[PDB]
Every structure is written in structure tokens, then in C-alpha cells.
Amino acid sequence: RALEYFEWLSX
Amino acid sequence: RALEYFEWLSX
Amino acid sequence: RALEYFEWLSX
Amino acid sequence: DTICIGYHANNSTDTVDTVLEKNVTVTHSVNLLEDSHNGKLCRLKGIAPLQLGKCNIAGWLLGNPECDPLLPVRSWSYIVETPNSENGICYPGDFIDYEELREQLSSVSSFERFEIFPKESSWPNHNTNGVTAACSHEGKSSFYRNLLWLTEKEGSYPKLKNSYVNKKGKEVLVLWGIHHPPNSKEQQNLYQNENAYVSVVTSNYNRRFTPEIAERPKVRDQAGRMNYYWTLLKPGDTIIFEANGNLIAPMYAFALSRGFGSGIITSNASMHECNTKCQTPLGAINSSLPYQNIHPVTIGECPKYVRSAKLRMVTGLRNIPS
Amino acid sequence: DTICIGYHANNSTDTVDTVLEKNVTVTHSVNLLEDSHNGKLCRLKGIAPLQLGKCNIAGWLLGNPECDPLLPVRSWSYIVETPNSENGICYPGDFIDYEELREQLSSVSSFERFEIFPKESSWPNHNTNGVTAACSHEGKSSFYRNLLWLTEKEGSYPKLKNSYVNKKGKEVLVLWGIHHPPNSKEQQNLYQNENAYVSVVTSNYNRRFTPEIAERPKVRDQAGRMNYYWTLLKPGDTIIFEANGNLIAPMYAFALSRGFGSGIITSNASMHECNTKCQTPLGAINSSLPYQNIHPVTIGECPKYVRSAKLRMVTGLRNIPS
Amino acid sequence: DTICIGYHANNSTDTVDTVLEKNVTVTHSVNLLEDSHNGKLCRLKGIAPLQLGKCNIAGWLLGNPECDPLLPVRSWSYIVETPNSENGICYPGDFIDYEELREQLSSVSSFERFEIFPKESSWPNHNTNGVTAACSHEGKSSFYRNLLWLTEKEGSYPKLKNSYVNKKGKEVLVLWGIHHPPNSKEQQNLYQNENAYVSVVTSNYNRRFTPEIAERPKVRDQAGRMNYYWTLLKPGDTIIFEANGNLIAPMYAFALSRGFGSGIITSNASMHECNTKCQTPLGAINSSLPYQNIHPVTIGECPKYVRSAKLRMVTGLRNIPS
Amino acid sequence: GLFGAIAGFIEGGWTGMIDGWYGYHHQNEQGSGYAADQKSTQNAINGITNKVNTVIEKMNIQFTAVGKEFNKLEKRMENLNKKVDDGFLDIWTYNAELLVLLENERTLDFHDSNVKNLYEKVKSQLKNNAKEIGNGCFEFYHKCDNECMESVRNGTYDYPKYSEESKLNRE
Amino acid sequence: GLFGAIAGFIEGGWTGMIDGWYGYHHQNEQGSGYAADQKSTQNAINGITNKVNTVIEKMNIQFTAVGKEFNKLEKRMENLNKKVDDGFLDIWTYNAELLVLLENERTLDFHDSNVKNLYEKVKSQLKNNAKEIGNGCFEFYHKCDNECMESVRNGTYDYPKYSEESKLNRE
Amino acid sequence: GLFGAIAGFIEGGWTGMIDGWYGYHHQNEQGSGYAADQKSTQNAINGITNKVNTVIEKMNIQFTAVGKEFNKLEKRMENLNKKVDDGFLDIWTYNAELLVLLENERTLDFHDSNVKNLYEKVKSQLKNNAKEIGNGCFEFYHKCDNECMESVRNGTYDYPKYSEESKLNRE
Ligand SMILES: *[C@@H]1O[C@H](CO)[C@@H](O[C@@H]2O[C@H](CO)[C@@H](O)[C@H](O)[C@H]2NC(C)=O)[C@H](O)[C@H]1NC(C)=O
Ligand SMILES: *[C@@H]1O[C@H](CO)[C@@H](O[C@@H]2O[C@H](CO)[C@@H](O)[C@H](O)[C@H]2NC(C)=O)[C@H](O)[C@H]1NC(C)=O
Ligand SMILES: *[C@@H]1O[C@H](CO)[C@@H](O[C@@H]2O[C@H](CO)[C@@H](O)[C@H](O)[C@H]2NC(C)=O)[C@H](O)[C@H]1NC(C)=O
Ligand SMILES: *[C@@H]1O[C@H](CO)[C@@H](O)[C@H](O)[C@H]1NC(C)=O
Ligand SMILES: *[C@@H]1O[C@H](CO)[C@@H](O)[C@H](O)[C@H]1NC(C)=O
Ligand SMILES: *[C@@H]1O[C@H](CO)[C@@H](O)[C@H](O)[C@H]1NC(C)=O
Ligand SMILES: *[C@@H]1O[C@H](CO)[C@@H](O)[C@H](O)[C@H]1NC(C)=O
Ligand SMILES: *[C@@H]1O[C@H](CO)[C@@H](O)[C@H](O)[C@H]1NC(C)=O
Ligand SMILES: *[C@@H]1O[C@H](CO)[C@@H](O)[C@H](O)[C@H]1NC(C)=O
Ligand SMILES: *[C@@H]1O[C@H](CO)[C@@H](O)[C@H](O)[C@H]1NC(C)=O
Ligand SMILES: *[C@@H]1O[C@H](CO)[C@@H](O)[C@H](O)[C@H]1NC(C)=O
Ligand SMILES: *[C@@H]1O[C@H](CO)[C@@H](O)[C@H](O)[C@H]1NC(C)=O
């Protein structure tokens, strides 16, 4: 899984 | 259960 | 078990 | 002028364990492990248990003469056997699928003992007075209260064929027996046919039994054997017995009612005038605690059994009266 | 001039539970519990299930006439029975080790129905046209498609002895039956021998069957009985049937292939043009979540079943838009 | 002048996992998972195992000629079978309740092989020299060391009836066999009675065996069969054999002692001069660690088996030599 | 403990504070005394009540469970039934003991944290109008009567009101 | 919470900080605004990602599991099979619910700790060139333009550069 | 970490401190050097020893457990026995791995807390006789010889004794 909660995170 | 350890608690 | 990591410990 | 911040302390000597440290004295704490019982057999949710006295399940079901006779109808919440049950099968032999039968009885909540085949009335042209010393009562030789030893009458054993139609509106436990003489001489003297057979059928049960004659080591001073069989006759169904020898016929049978939460336990304790929600072989538990270390065998609504000696939760603080 | 340190907040209304506190509104969170299904029977990894229609396993295997005939060869990923399976054993009697047979079929992935003993060709000097009303089809009296009721021909039932050598390169499920007339008159009229017997042997199977005649309560208007037997004939091995009466002979048998991940389920749902990796009796699950509260019965790669109503993990912060 | 507060650091390269982070290098740590074995079969608490060599349990118990003969009395801590056990049942047939027998042997710690029915002395008026090629030894046709093939002598097979009274003060495992010829011609040539029977009784055991003649596929070049039976004769009790044919009589029996912690394992490894507290089929474990990932099968006092590849507990600090 | 207050820079507890878990002691001209903080005590009670109740709730009611019997030719099934009973028992004994240990650790830590947080709340309220004299105590640089004390206890301390006098005494 | 920041001395969250979990708000002559701290947000994301993924990983794939059937003379075996299924189900329901509760508690604590640590990092950077005005805010004793603000945010604040002016305003 | 000391405001560890987990480094006229704090190291050792030992104790001795055999007409019982063995194995593998992860997290946190608490203990002992120069270090406003240093290390630092000289240097 990946936590895409913010758009600058690396993964 | 209820923890009646002090007499002013609300429950 | 005993953790003998240092030589002054008590156990 | 000063103000200080601090915390509670009291005289408590309660100790709890943690991961980093054992045996910590705390101000408050809750015990989660029940370890007390009342040492008595009690009613379970207002229903008394079925106590078999001197009998085990086999002795009660076959009708062993030594065991005091129960009322015709009983209802219970659990069944109790005593550890030293001396009266069970009194005439030597195998009781087929006995364990399965116990497991059936584990969900039965009521029985009605009724006469399925009346003694003097159902097996004409046969003797019904057969008794034995292996099943003695008050010194005299006797026999199972629920079974009937059919033998030859006036030098002849005519083929019998009788049936019962179940109109009780409940399952009917029917038990019977098959006798195996040690020699052919006794086989002839009892049943007058060397090639005898027994047949028992219902809509879903179908079995045939043949005498097997051989000399055997004495058990309870008997070289002969007696094999015990049973079946549950469904409501409306019909059971048919047919034989020309060796049949230990049914006389009384059991109308059975199903229930939940019951079971069979072996216990020493005595029945008292008391009620509980949880019963163990050692005594009854009255608790709302989540765990108990009293006994793995439980009937009713009980805490979960664990091996732990202690399960105490801290709620207060580390107690430092210093 | 000022600088402040703070934290995220948003409009989210997700709530999670903790130990010290229940029902906490948080900014982010992940649900770990799958609770949705599509309500359909689907293909499992691209392979359709075996649907038995009006039949259960017994009805399909014996060849009950009421059940539409399947294609000669089938391959499946799981077997589906319907709750209301009216067509099973149509002629009354016991199907020995039936449960064990179901458990065998639970790891079978393919069958080929082939004629092991051709009808007019294998049992000479015997009649093969026996039918019954208990196994009716389109009103008329009929019989199992996979079995053959051998009876006397021209007033005689000669001893038969036939055999099959397994050259399929796979296990072969062979089924047969043993008939039990209610009286000796019918026994004679059908098989012309009162002392009949049936013998079935392979390299590892060895059983002998004897007619047991007695009057029995009517089941499906039949007082007679029919006991059903089966064995798995290993590749290269030979099965031998030998009888002088009462044999309900095999006519069709099953060449079987073993597989993994299969099973038998009882379901109401319908087959659709769809594919899944996880199938339950209520419907298919398409999820990668670790838990599911939909059904304990699963076929394929499924999440672990739990009783929980909610399993939600917080990832964000305690949400305080105030 | 300055003073600083800091923490330990060292050159360690131990890594552990946490929840928030994987693969953390730490200064100290303890491994809880044992993954090493010595690859040998050892003594368990000073007692050597029972090795069956070329035999499995069946071959050893029946007395298969191919298997080297063991000393008359043995005591062990666990039983070892080899994966490729070629010598078991050498004459084709079923060994009834074989699995149950293995389970009985799983708690046996000692046996004494003694002559229960001496060869030339117990079955007068019968031949005792029967041998077969299915049980060959050194090329020649032979037979089980513990059983005796009784056949007709001088054109007659008189009814035999022999018995043994158990005065060993321990349970006595008695084994016997029942032969089933492929035709009645051989039945007559061997036992001179077409209606033969075998009867075996004790105080709690009671079984009768009847020859069932039919042609069968050849197994080990044999169309006949031989069914093997067993019973545990309680101390003081008496076993009685009675037959007029087909009895494969007992000659040697086993006096058995019960123990704890034993079991049966299949292993490849070899016995060495070594001792252990924990034995697995792959080798012995000498550890006090709580877990092991070596093998699910364990004998003795062993760590709990887990599938884990790694279970390492940190005790020191996050190691930052920078 | 983890937060360093209980059995830390606040060495011991108060037998004299009988109406709460966490509290105050004050000393001024009008006299001295103990008074528990109810806001924090009641928060801790709520938390720990919910913890205990969940430990109880997670364990379902154990309904009827009795032994079975097996004949002399069913040893394997008997041993399998025993294996099942013993396995489940091991697992539940393990689970119970471990859960109690873990939660006990966390509970003591929780208390420690509550005491530290209360201390810090007071400190941040008082600022430089008082000095930390160790052991969790503050010495005012001004006269603090009962009303002042109570303003500190119920979180409404008026720093500017005493700022001047405090500055003078602090010099 | 355990560390006293979230819902503590920093009362509420910021709906206006949309690009991260933890962050800053600033006010100077050039204007005001929000800016999340990526170093800490990205560390927290890494951690919690690894936590979620392990909770998922520890649960193996549940392969095929269906019921069995038993005849009327196999009641004991049927009840034993049921006992096994119900036991395993109890244990897994327990394990799942408990693990989720524990980890949730620890996650909220983890966030609280991250916010506190960030606050302390800033405080230690600023020293006496600014004053704590509560609610997690600092008031500078000097003019702090966008460049200064950014130096604070990316951990390179030059204390000596503003030490004099700050000393003067602090007087 | 949770308390912000290890890999926090104290960036790295000391290879030169070989006699303990937590400790001091000092520099004065007489020279410089490392000396571990035994009171805290020995407390941590006691704790972690008790943790390890309980993890071992909670796992009972695994007594003899071997496979059983079933004939070709006992497939259901064979699969039920297998189901039991596999279930118990799943549960114990899960329990072991999870317990080790949880306890590892808590252990690192525990260390972090010990280091922070030690630092705070020193800080509160020194007060304004020294200044925090970051990285866990203190710079004295007075001469601190070996005896002074040791008084700091064994918790008996005499603040009034150096208060004047410190006040003068601090000016
Ligand atoms: C656990 O802690 C208790 C204290 O809470 C210990 O009991 C005390 O032991 C001392 C030393 O013998 C006695 O003087 C006290 O009277 C005891 N108190 C009570 C209430 O009995 C106990 O020794 C500790 N046990 C272990 C195993 O550590
Ligand atoms: C759990 O918390 C939620 C809030 O996250 C509660 O739901 C709110 O309840 C109030 C009071 O009735 C309503 O005004 C809000 O509209 C509700 N919010 C939502 C999103 O429904 C809920 O009552 C709490 N439940 C329990 C059992 O504590
Ligand atoms: C786990 O961490 C270890 C360090 O403790 C990593 O091993 C190092 O990897 C770097 C990069 O390849 C090498 O330069 C070092 O020599 C390695 N150290 C050792 C002792 O082997 C490892 O890569 C990490 N593994 C994972 C899966 O994260
Ligand atoms: C402790 O003191 C209380 C009074 O504060 C008293 O009621 C109680 O009995 C004492 N408890 C014990 C266990 O000595
Ligand atoms: C159980 O014990 C409690 C505690 O006194 C009591 O209130 C209750 O009446 C008891 N119930 C029974 C059925 O014994
Ligand atoms: C909350 O607000 C976002 C915009 O910030 C919007 O996209 C979303 O739909 C809202 N969510 C709910 C559940 O109201
Ligand atoms: C399962 O659902 C996901 C979500 O839309 C989708 O990407 C995938 O194609 C689906 N797979 C199947 C086999 O239904
Ligand atoms: C690390 O250094 C120590 C000496 O401080 C040495 O004894 C040891 O062998 C080294 N360990 C490894 C694994 O390199
Ligand atoms: C097990 O290994 C330890 C470690 O060397 C040793 O002390 C002990 O003697 C060994 N015991 C046996 C029985 O091998
Ligand atoms: C504490 O503050 C409250 C306001 O919330 C105030 O009304 C009260 O008078 C104060 N304390 C007292 C009782 O003086
Ligand atoms: C923040 O510091 C970096 C150096 O790591 C510097 O290059 C950058 O210019 C600073 N902030 C900005 C963008 O002014
Ligand atoms: C540290 O304090 C102790 C008193 O507990 C004192 O006796 C000792 O001399 C001090 N340090 C040294 C060794 O100078």
C-alpha cells in the first residue's frame, strides 16, 4: 500500500 | 464496570 | 538469562 | 508562597506485573481472574441437573436394577455422573456406539420413560421371565428394567415380529440386546434354534444380528455375552423387530426432547438448594470476571478458563507513600 | 513578527477506536475489513464451477434421471450444491462412506464419464431392463443412468463374473448397489436364488455383500432397500464383480483428476459471466484487504474471516478543525 | 568548561525490525529463534531410539523375514521409520486398525518378544510348515517369524482350541491372521472344510472371522489375501483361539510397557554416539531458545515451531557511530 | 517512568490528597492544603474505565464446554481432541497474561504523562512570576492568596496582574 | 495525548495547512501564511506506511476452507470440527480487534510526539531571540523577513545575526 | 524517536563510552573524558532483562508432538488434523513475530526516554550556572574541576557554591 496523502511525498 | 474511586466523578 | 553487557552490573 | 504539583498515594498493597518490571505496588487495581467456587452442585438458570446416583449413562439407560428408579418424566440442565459408578452394564458385553449415544444425550433436555412393548401382551408364545445373577438386586437374580429376556416356551421359540409406531411427536430412543451363549447346548435350551437371527428396521435403520457361539473367559461369572444396541426413531416412523432367538427385547423406551447448553460432567459435589449461571465439576461460579482458573469443564455462562495464577490489571498509580 | 507550530486538520469524519478512548474523529485512516460482495457465482481464476442443478452429489454420481445430464467431460474450480436439492438417492437405502466420498470429490478438478460395462454386451443371460417408480422420470418408472438393475432371465440367474482393467491413466470411481427385497418371494422372483451373494475385489479393495430380507416401513413407497457402495480403482488395477443375485451393476464410471483449492459449497446465487479470485456462498469478493466479515466459507485467495463489524486503522491525526 | 550527556555506541551490525521501521542497526540484541541442528539421530535423555531398519511398524510386528531380528527385549525413547521402507506386509491383505495400533505403540516404551504358542507343541494334528514366496528370505520361500500358517495334516483339519493366560503383569499385544484363498479347491486342499471359521475371544474382545473366496488381481504374485488382526490382552486376562481352518496363528507376542514423551518419526539421519533433550527428523536441537524453525515434528523438550525466518529482540540502543 | 515525573523529579506521592489521582498542594499566608485537579483525574478515570471495559468486552462469554469419551480403538481421535483443547488453552493463557502485562505498562506510563502534563501546564501559566524549586514545586515572586491559588488551579492565572511585583522581588 | 501537544498546549489543527501533517504559520511585514514541514511529515508517512503494511503482511492469504459433513453416528467428530472452527474464529477476531486498538493508540501518540518534537526543535533554535506566547507560537524580538522565516523552517536560523537587536527589544 | 533525544537533539552515539549505555563526557582544565552513568544503565539493564525473560517465560516447553496416520477412508479426519496443526502454527507464528516487533519498538522508545530523563536531570541540577549549547552539552559559567564534574554526575551539584562566579561570568 502507499499513502498518497500529500503530493510531494516520495512512495 | 465503573471506577468509583473518588466521589465526584461523573459514571 | 543475564545481560552481561557491562562488567559492573549486579546479575 | 508556594504551590506544588503531585499525585495520589494511599496505603494499598496491591501488586501488579509489567513488562519491564515485576511486582509493582499500586494505589488501585482490578482483578480479572476468578478463583472462587461454592463447592456445590446447583441449579442452572432455575433448572436442576439430572443425577444418576450409583449409575452411569449405560446403567441408567439399560435399567440396571441396583439404581433407584427415577420419576417417569425428567427435565434437566446438565447430567451428572459420579466418579465411582459401580452400576453400569451388569451383564458382560459390548454397548455399540455408546460414546455417540452419550454425545446425543449431551443435547437432550428431557425424557419420558414409557412402555413401548408391554410385558405380558407383546411376545405371545414366549417366556419373558428370564433373569441372571450378574444383574442381581437385593441378593436375588434379576434383570434390566427396560429390557426383557425372551426365551423358549413349552419347548419352542416361534418367530416373533412386533412393531412400534412413534406417535409421541418426538424422537424415541429404543434400546435392545443380542445374547451370545457360550455353547450350542445352551443356545438350543434357550431359543430352540441353532440358526437364529434378529432383525431390526426403521425407515433409516437396518441391521441384522447373528449369534456367535464360543467359550469365553468368565466376566462377572458369565461366559456368555450380551451386545447392546440403540437407535433414535424419528416422529411418525415405525420400528420393526423380528426374531427366532437371542433377542433381548425392548420393554421401555425414551421420548426425548432437545435443548441447548447441556452436557455431561463427572462430579463429587452434592446438590444444594441454590442457583447459578455457571457450573463446574468442583462447584458453581458466580462471577462476571472474564477469566477463571478453577476448571476447564464448564456448563452455562462462564468466564474463560486459563492456567494463570494471577491476572491483575492496575488502574491507579505507582504507590509511593514515602 | 510571529511564527507558530501546528498540525493538519481537515473535514474528515472518519472515526476509530483506541484503548483509552472510543470513537475518535481523525484526519486519515485505513479500513482493513472487507464487507462487500457482488452477490454472484463467478469463475475462479478463469475456471467455471461445477453446478449440480437439482441434484446433490449422490444424485449426480448415481445418475438420478430427474437431473439434466451433464457433458461427458467436465473441469471445474469448485462444486456448488443448491440448498433445496430434491433429487438425490431416489431408491431408499444407505450410501456407505458417502461423506468420505464427498471429501474425495473436494480435491477432484475433472471427471470423464465413460461406459465401464456396456449394457447389452456385458451381462449375458440376465435381464437389464429393471426399473422403479421411486426413480421416476417424466411420469414413467425409470432408473439410475449410471447403474443397471440385473434380474433373472428366462427363469434363471446364472452366476456372473465380469471385470474392468483401468487403462485411463487416472483413478476411476466405480459405484454399485446391493438390493434388499422385503420378502423371499420377491428375492426368488428377481434373482432365483435365496442364498445369493455379491463380491467386489481390486488389488486393495475386498468386500462381500449378502441380501438381508425383512419387511420394512415404506420409504418413497418402497419396503425394499438399496445400499450404495463405491471404490477408487487405481491406474492399471483391475476390479472384479461376481454375483448370483441382488447386484445393481455399474454401467458408467468416472475417470478422475486431482487438483488444489477446490471444495463443495451450498449456494443460492446464480452463475454470471464474471471472474474472481475469491468466492463465497453469498457472492464473490474482490479485495486485497486482510479481513472480511462476509462468510466463513471461502474458495480461493480470500481475506481472513472475522466476526468484527469494524476494523479501521488510523493513519492521520486527531482531527480538530475548531 | 563543558559537560555533555550522551549514549553508547559500538561497531555492532545487528539489525532488528520494529513496527514503524524495518531494519534498524542496534548496539545489542537477542536472538530468540533457533535454526541449527546437528544432523544426527541421538539418545533422548539417555535412552536410545527404536530403529526398525528396513521395516516399518507392520513388518516389524508381523515378523517379516527380511528385517534383521531385534534383541528379545527392547526399551526406547522414540521409534524411527525410514522413508523407503520396502519390507512391510509381504503377503497381500488388510491390516485392520493398523493406524490405531501405531498410535498405541506411540506411548509404548518397552517390549518383550516371547513365545505365546510354541510351534511344535500347540497345534497338534495340524501342519505348521506353511511358507510362501511373497515372504521370501535369502531366495527361499518363507513366512512371518511371529505367525504360523496352520494347514491340514494327513488329509484332515481337526477343530483346534487353544488359549493363553497373561501372567506377564503387563499388556500383551497379540497378532493373528485370516487367510482367504482365491478358490474353493485351494480352500479344501489347505483346510479340508469349505465352511470354516475362526473365533478369537478375551474378556473384552470378541470377534469371528469367515473365509471369503473369490478370484482377485495378483498382488506380489498372489491372488489370495491375508487379513491381519490384533488385540491388547490385559494383565491376568485370557485369550482363546478356536478354528477349523484359515487361521494364521500367533506364535510370538509382545509384552508391553507404557511410557511418556515418545512418538514415531520418519527420518533419514543416522544414529550417533550423542545425547540430546530435543530430537527432530532432521537432527537434534540443543537450545534453550523459545522458538525454532527447523521442523514441526519434535520429540522431547523442544522450542515452539514457527515459520519465521527471523525473531531478533533488541536490548541495546539504536547504533549511531557517526 | 517514561515521562520522568512519577518516581522521577517528583519523588513520592501524597497520602494527604484523598480526593483525586493528580493534584496540588499550596502554602500561603491564609494557610496550606491539598486539592486534587478534577479535570485531569476525570479524564484519566474515563480512559482507564474504557481500557478495563474493553479488556473485559474482548473476551466473549464461554458457553458450555465439556469432555467427550472414546473407546479403546479411538486413541487417535482422543489425542486429537486433547491436542485441540490444550492448544486453545495455551493460546488463551498466553493472550491473557501478555495483554495484562502490556496494558499495565501502558497504564503506569499514562499516569506519569498526566502528572508531567499538569506540571508543565502550571509552569507555562506562571512563567517568570515564580521559580522552580524542584520536586514539582513553584515559589512565587509575589503574594498569592487563596483567590490567586485557585486561579492557578482552574487555569485562569493572571500573569500581568502580578508581573510588576514579581519583577521587583526577582530584581 | 501522551506528549501534551495535540489537543494540549496546541489546542486545535489547521484546516489552512493543506500540504502536510505538521507545519508552520508565520506572520511578518511581507505577509502571512502556512507551510508544512516536509522532513517530519515524510518521516511520519514512512513510519505509518510501514505499520499499515506490516499489519497487512502478518495476515497470510486465507486459502480454501469449506465445511465437512458427518452422518448421524458421527456427532462427536462433527462437534469437534465445529469446536475447532469456532475456536480459531474467536482467536482471530480477538487478535484483529486488539491489534487495531493498540496500534491506533500508538499512532495518535506518535503524531503527538512528532508535533512536540518539532516545536522543541524550533524553540531551541530561537532561544531568547523570541518569546513563547503560548499555543505553540513564538513572537520575535526582532524583524524576521521571509528569508529569516525560511531559515527557521529549514533549520538554519542564525541566532547571533539577530542577537543584538533582540537583546535591545527585550531590554 | 518518541522522546526526541536519541537520533534527535543528541545526533549520535559515543564509541568512546565503553562502560555503559548512557553517560557523560566532560572537558575541564584537568583534562577530558567519558564516564557512563551506572544508576540509569543498571536500571535499564534490569528492565530489559525482565522483558527478555518474560518473553521467554511466556512460551511453554513444547513437549512431544508427532504426526498421525489415516487410511484411505479417513480423509476427513486427516484434513481436520491438518487443519488443526496449520491453524495453531499460523497463530503462533503471528503471535511471535508481532510480540517481537511491538517490544522492539517499545525498547527503543525506552532508551530514548532514559537519555532524555538523564539530560533533564542534569539541566535541572545546573540551572543558570551553565548554558545549553545544544547537542546535549552544557557550558559552565564557572570553573568546574573533577570534583565539581563528579558532583554533577552523582547528583550532588552545589548550585549556590558557584552561583556568584556564574552570575559574574553570565553578567
Ligand atoms: C513484591 O512486592 C511486595 C511489596 O509490595 C513484597 O512484599 C513485601 O516484602 C517485604 C520484604 O520481605 C516485606 O517487608 C513486606 O512486608 C512485604 N509486603 C507485603 C504486603 O507482604 C514482596 O516481597 C515482593 N515479591 C517479589 C517476588 O518480588
Ligand atoms: C462517535 O463520534 C461521532 C463524531 O465523529 C458522533 O457523531 C456525531 O454525533 C453528534 C451528536 O449526535 C452529531 O451532531 C454529529 O452530526 C455526528 N457526526 C456524524 C459524522 O455523524 C457519534 O455520536 C459518536 N458515537 C459514539 C457511539 O460515541
Ligand atoms: C538493512 O540494514 C543494513 C544495515 O544495518 C543494510 O546493510 C548495509 O547495506 C549497505 C548498502 O548496500 C552496505 O553498504 C552495508 O555494507 C550493509 N551492511 C551490512 C552489515 O551488510 C541492508 O541493506 C538493509 N536491508 C534492508 C532490506 O533494508
Ligand atoms: C487502608 O486505609 C483505609 C483508610 O484510609 C482503611 O479503610 C483500609 O482498611 C486500609 N486498608 C488495608 C488493606 O489495610
Ligand atoms: C452473585 O453474587 C452477587 C454478589 O453478592 C449477588 O449480588 C448475586 O445475587 C449472586 N447471584 C447468585 C445467583 O448467586
Ligand atoms: C471534504 O472537503 C474536500 C475538499 O477539501 C472535498 O473534496 C470532500 O468531498 C469533503 N469530504 C466529505 C466527506 O464531505
Ligand atoms: C477488482 O477491483 C479492482 C478495483 O476496481 C479492479 O481494478 C480489478 O480489475 C477487479 N478485478 C476483478 C477480477 O474483478
Ligand atoms: C567489534 O569490535 C570489538 C572490539 O571493540 C571486537 O571484539 C569485535 O570482534 C568486533 N565485532 C565485529 C562483528 O566486527
Ligand atoms: C548443549 O550445548 C551447550 C553449549 O555448549 C553445552 O554447554 C551443553 O553441554 C550441550 N549439551 C548437550 C547435551 O549437548
Ligand atoms: C475559577 O474560574 C471560574 C471561571 O470558569 C470562576 O468563575 C471561578 O470563580 C474561579 N475560581 C473561583 C471559584 O474563585
Ligand atoms: C535553506 O537552507 C538551504 C541549505 O540547505 C539553502 O540553500 C536555502 O537557500 C535555504 N532556504 C531558502 C530556499 O532560502
Ligand atoms: C559523590 O557523592 C558521594 C555521596 O553519596 C560522595 O561520598 C562522593 O565522595 C562523591 N563523589 C566523589 C567520589 O567525590
Side-chain angles (χ1 to χ4, degrees), chain I residues 146-147 150-151 154-156:
Chain I
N146 283 341
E147 186 176 346
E150 170 62 24
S151 77
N154 79 356
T156 64

Side-chain angles (χ1 to χ4, degrees), chain E residues 3-4 7-8 261 304 307, chain H residues 10 21 25 62 64 90 137:
Chain E
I3 189 172
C4 299
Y7 43 85
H8 193 65
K304 169 73 72 179
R307 301 188 179 98
Chain H
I10 306 177
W21 271 338
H25 175 88
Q62 174 64 65
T64 301
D90 294 340
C137 296

